[PDB]
Amino acid sequence: KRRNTIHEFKKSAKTTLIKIDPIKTKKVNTADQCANRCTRNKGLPFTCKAFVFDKARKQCLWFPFNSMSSGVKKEFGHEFDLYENKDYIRNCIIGKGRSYKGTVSITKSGIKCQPWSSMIPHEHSFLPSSYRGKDLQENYCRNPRGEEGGPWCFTSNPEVRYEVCDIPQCSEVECMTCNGESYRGLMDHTESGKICQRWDHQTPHRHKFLPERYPDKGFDDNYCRNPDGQPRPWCYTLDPHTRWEYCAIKTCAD
Amino acid sequence: KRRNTIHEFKKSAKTTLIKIDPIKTKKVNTADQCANRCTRNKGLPFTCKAFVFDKARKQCLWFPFNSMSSGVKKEFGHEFDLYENKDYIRNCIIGKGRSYKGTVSITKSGIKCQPWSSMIPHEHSFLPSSYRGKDLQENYCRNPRGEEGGPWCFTSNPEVRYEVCDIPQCSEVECMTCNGESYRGLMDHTESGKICQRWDHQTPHRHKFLPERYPDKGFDDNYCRNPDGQPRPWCYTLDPHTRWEYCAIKTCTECIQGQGEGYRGTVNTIWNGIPCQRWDSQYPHEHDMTPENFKCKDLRENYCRNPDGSESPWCFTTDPNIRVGYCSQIPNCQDCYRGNGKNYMGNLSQTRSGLTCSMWDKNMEDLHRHIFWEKLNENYCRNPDDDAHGPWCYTGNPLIPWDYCPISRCVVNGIPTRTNIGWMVSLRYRNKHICGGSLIKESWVLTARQCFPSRDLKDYEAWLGIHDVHGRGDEKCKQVLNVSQLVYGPEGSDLVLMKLARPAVLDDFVSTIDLPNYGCTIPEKTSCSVYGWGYTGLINYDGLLRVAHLYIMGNEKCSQHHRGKVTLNESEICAGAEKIGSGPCEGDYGGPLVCEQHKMRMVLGVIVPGRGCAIPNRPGIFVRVAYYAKWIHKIILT
Amino acid sequence: CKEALAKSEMNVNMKYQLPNFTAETPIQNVILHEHHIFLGATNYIYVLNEEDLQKVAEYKTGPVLEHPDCFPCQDCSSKANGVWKDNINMALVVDTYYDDQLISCGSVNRGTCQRHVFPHNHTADIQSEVHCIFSPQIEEPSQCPDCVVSALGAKVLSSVKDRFINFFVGNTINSSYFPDHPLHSISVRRLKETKDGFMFLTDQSYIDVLPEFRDSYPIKYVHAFESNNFIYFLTVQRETLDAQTFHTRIIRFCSINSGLHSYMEMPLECILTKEVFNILQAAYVSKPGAQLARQIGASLNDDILFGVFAQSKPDSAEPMDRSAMCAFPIKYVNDFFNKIVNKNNVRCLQHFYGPNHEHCFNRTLLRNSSGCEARRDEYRTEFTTALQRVDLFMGQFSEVLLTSISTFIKGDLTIANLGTSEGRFMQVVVSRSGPSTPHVNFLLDSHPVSPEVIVEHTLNQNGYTLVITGKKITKIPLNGLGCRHFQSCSQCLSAPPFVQCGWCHDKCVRSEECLSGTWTQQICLPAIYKVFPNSAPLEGGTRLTICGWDFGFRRNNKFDLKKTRVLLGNESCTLTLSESTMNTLKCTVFNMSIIISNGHGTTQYSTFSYVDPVITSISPKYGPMAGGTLLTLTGNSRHISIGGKTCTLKSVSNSILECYTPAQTISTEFAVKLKIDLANRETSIFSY
């Protein structure tokens, strides 16, 4: 009845965000279900790229805007627990990257991207209404078909119709020190192409480690580390079938 | 999900309808599902024009007729509640007229539109059989084909088969006052085309108002009311996602009128892009203006308007530092009906020719020295002097001190002349004649735009004082001059002045002519003549300049002769030869129509080509210098 | 059985009686004016009333002796020495600025034009007053201001600027024609007010292809129109003269009679997706309907250019009979010329300025900063970055050549009066949103449709479209020529609402004729044609093909093949998605009625049975083992085999099956088991 899309959501607690620059709040017992309302397609009349929960107020509020926008104020409201969507802040490509929402408007050859709203110079840009939830914003280049080549956009330059934005994979700036447990990184990519399980939640696979009982070993979001010093990083899986799997990280030097 | 068209129904309390001359009753819990069934197609064979439910009965009885149906007795029965189909009773247009289902049976000429079942007197009445599902009413006019024109009803009148019907939109009919709370109306739509829910309902919003608990405010059905004293009345939305919305009612848009004071706006964004806080909220610096604003404007919101009637609409920027940010982004309806400069604050800085306006202040000094009409912006082409032709700008360059910034605004059968003549100016293009012109001052001639194929001056050459178009007749008075400069008239003028490289000696052989008074209006039937250098319809013309007399006629007379082929404007004159066809043609363009007013003779027009050549019993059309005489003066001051 | 149920597809060829007028010779141009409709045709001028197309008045432009010394409009009938050539009208215009006159513009007679005058009381009588435009150019006899129109091909557009009737004329020029008598590629003519000649206002007023490129680089003009204080032209010229591949081009210049000061060519192409069509067959300028307005992003009031782009034989101008139609919101094209292409894309203009010239070497383009200001040093320009468009039909016409197009609006939709090469005249509700099937697709005439089409829409509910095919002029009411031709319910519901008719249980029919009152336009029952097969064993869940139509839920354009289910008795047969189409079903499950349920209606078909198989008798009984003898069986989609080897099936029937026994290296008898997808009851033994 619910999906732990928090495996996708980004967590920062004891904080709050306000944008007093002229908002929907729904009562749920769990941030997971509030995220589920946000995840549910058509369910949310506004496109929430964030939301905060507090267990204490029994209320959840959802923002159609992340901290990345201007006009947002960051404060220490300890009861409030933020929830971002790392997909926007990714600035990385995951395979086909069908769900790429990042704000890159430049192509490999350096000619501006055409807005998806303007039919000049390319009239195959009728997609802003064709595919709801494409997040296809004003100009930034996405992958509305989830086509394999990568996020492509139409160029203002009349000659070339579409060119694929080159966008570096998250792995390229990620290395692993031979132990890996010292490495405190940003990846969430196993070898089998699955996303980790949430540490703080214990569902569905039930694991022994909780971040509160082992703080400063960074069991945050779903970040493949070495909790016990394995050669290369690892986590429990969301997948009901596989208990746990490593994560493949390249090595750095110098 | 299921169905929900109960909202489209009306209701009334404690009345039951008894049709004395006639339908099923079913124990159904929900009168709402009952109404939904009545709206749902195929629910009832008969024509469920309304419904009634009695919750004491809990028996669902749809009524295939209105209370406006004859012979039906209402009865004050508490337990019974009526639910009317608002389509037929409202009788006002809402959106498309493609599916008009309202009870109106009156022609545009106020005749009763016949029963459509009545073959009398007009044949095509089998319309309900021909089109079903169109609600082709008994007698009320309804669009049968979705015709553009709308419900056209076969009038009962013997003379006219059918006459059309006009239904006003409900939104225009409905109005609210500045308070708005006192307003009671059947409008039930929000400002975004959304619909208000039934006040009695508790879904999808379970708001505070219980209409029985707070009666006397007209909380009936989905009607917009002002329960919480907003400048506009508002309702809770039928859509669960939208909490509530304002209702669009006129008093009892984007494009700006005036300084935006009476204007109202839904945009709080400015030129710096900062969104603006509501007049309701004192945020940010707790300005005392926000409480004052409630009194200042009785129409308001989180959006930005002009409660004080400032020149640029103002709001309160979320930016705490700035108290007021001007919402100047919204456009203003690019000039019309204001030919006077001061009425138009023109935000533009480029002239007709292509040169940018200069720093206004030096120009104010020079003009106050020069121009004597009686604080306007720096370097914007709004004209100060409220000139007839409209907005205009100053240019630095000497040869063109000033010019308008471009904006929207609102002889055949003649006689030879026996004697040498001075006003005549023979224009010569590659050393041959092309047009005649008029001599105004010692270095200035008046001609028509049509006569300048090339703009070049290295080729044009003017002669003055001549009796023969080639000069073979005489040369003593022939004055050869180069051409210094060209100046075009106002836009739409077809009028031009050209100024000479050097002056000329003025004597008997060469003469100038005065100009009319600003509104100098010719008496009708006044006699005066044209002088022409044209072909003259002559197998041979020796080259004498040829004169043709003429009489001024009214613009109306030329409208009659031209049979509507002329759409007469203010600036033209029309003078026409009487009972004879004689007029200027090729070569006469720029020729002067000179009319002796009182004691002396004076110029009134320019010969310009139009509608045919020398047509008998057809007048002639010229441009009246009077409409441009002032412009001639201002330019001749250069 | 897709072929058999193809009767569902509309009858493409049905015959219509419409007001049809025929001429003796081919018709080239036609003009509508004041309740008369003139036609120019080979050697003839025809004026016809609209609603009947009765040839009321005929004026004959006689074939005319062409003799080298005989002057154009002097009369040389007396000459006895030199050929009785014929004339074909290429320019017919109406002027009413001066007086209500018609102007015709002949081919053979040196291309000199003449004007007919309408008397006031009676307008059809054109033959009364005819005056030939002609002025002996005494000043500079070397050039023709009056030799207007060429022979090979031309377009002529009339306008009234500055109280001035200007003819903007384009000509096709063969190298041979010039030295005898000059012409010009594009030119601007003032009519002399005394209506007896034309004047060239300046040597600038014209542009002629340089003397060397006459024979090469031929440009033929295909359309000419006016908008927004500009006079565009549409032509087809090779991008490079050496390359010799023709491509579509557009011409822009403001209407100043002094000459063509702001002369700009741009390449225009329409692609499909990257296949590019380099040829344009016809064009029509119109305003768009509400639906298309947003869909191409244009405001409801802006002009729109519709062009039927076609693929062309490579390295040649001949169309390949593959076509498209594409829409060019005029605001887009004007923006493209002024700022979208920068100076690097711009060049000088080859055919006039020359391959190498001082102008070609270097020049600033006051392209953005100035619009049309008359420059004595006017610059001829040729862009290089074609304005790319995409198809409006997404290539649904990829195989059939289009030759003539027109467009009107209706409600919010916008309609196209397409015409093909073989004389079929479609009408399509055009939208990028959905592939929409023509609601009229009748065959008009054997000859190709001419591009010259006159369309008049009156009071928005009564209009018509004159179209010209070969020697035939026809009046088509745009109001929906009919809907009798529809026979498939989905098609009945897909036909746009402006034609009022809907399904009543058997055929798409106008509302007020069929009495059953079942006439509906929103929801209708599906129809089954047949079922194969209807003999099913109890255990056999066997492949049943179902032939019918309307098997998909009907929504706007998309068909919801998902709101479908099959009920057999009480159980539901197994419905498989990839083989279920609104055309057919392919399902796999005591006469029983099959029921088919759809998102709209449910249909009952009684042609099904649960037949119980019977086998009783076998031949032979005792024999040898050679494995080649035939076997005869009898009883009540199958297979038969013995000893692991399948006998070849000599014959098939419900009640008589023949098989050639397989060869088995054994001398005893075997019970033979039928395998009808399943091992049903075996038969007895036969002595090998």
Numbering used by the authors:
A (entry chain A): 34 to 55, 59 to 290
B (entry chain D): 34 to 55, 59 to 288, 303 to 383, 389 to 429, 434 to 469, 495 to 722
C (entry chain E): 26 to 106, 110 to 301, 311 to 626, 634 to 680, 687 to 738
Paper text:
C-MET receptor, which belongs to the receptor tyrosine kinase (RTK) family, plays essential roles in controlling a number of critical cellular processes such as cell proliferation, survival, motility, and morphogenesis. C-MET can be activated by its cognate ligand—hepatocyte growth factor (HGF). Structurally, the c-MET receptor is composed of a Semaphorin (SEMA) domain, a plexin-semaphorin-integrin (PSI) domain, and four consecutive immunoglobulin-plexin-transcription factors (IPT1-4) domains in the extracellular region, a single transmembrane helix (TM), and an intracellular KD. HGF, the ligand of c-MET, is secreted as a single chain 83 kDa precursor protein containing an N-terminal (N) domain, four consecutive kringle (K1–K4) domains, and a serine protease homology (SPH) domain.
Nevertheless, after further 3D classification, a cryo-EM map reconstructed from a smaller class of particles reveals a complete version of HGF II that forms a tripartite interaction with c-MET II and HGF I. The structures of the NK2 segment of HGF II can be superimposed well onto that of HGF I, suggesting that no domain rearrangements occur in this structural segment. However, as compared with the structure of HGF I, the K3, K4, and SPH domains of HGF II undergo a large structural relocation with respect to NK2. In the 1:2 c-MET/HGF complex, the SPH and K1 domains of HGF II contact the SEMA and PSI domains of c-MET, respectively; while the K2 and K3 domains of HGF II also make weak interaction with the N domain of HGF I. Additionally, two well-defined cryo-EM densities were identified in the N domains of both HGFs that could be attributed to heparins. These two heparin molecules are bound at the same site within the N domains of two HGFs and are surrounded by the same set of positively charged residues. Notably, weak cryo-EM density was observed between two closely adjacent heparins, suggesting that the two heparin molecules are likely to be part of the same heparin polymer. Hence, a long heparin polymer could crosslink HGF I and II by simultaneous binding both HGFs and thereby stabilize the c-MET II-HGF I-HGF II tripartite interaction. In a small subset of particles, HGF II becomes rigid, and contacts both HGF I and c-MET II, with the help of a long heparin molecule. In this particular conformation, HGF II binding strengthens the interaction between HGF I and c-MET II and thereby stabilizes the entire c-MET I/HGF I/c-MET II complex.
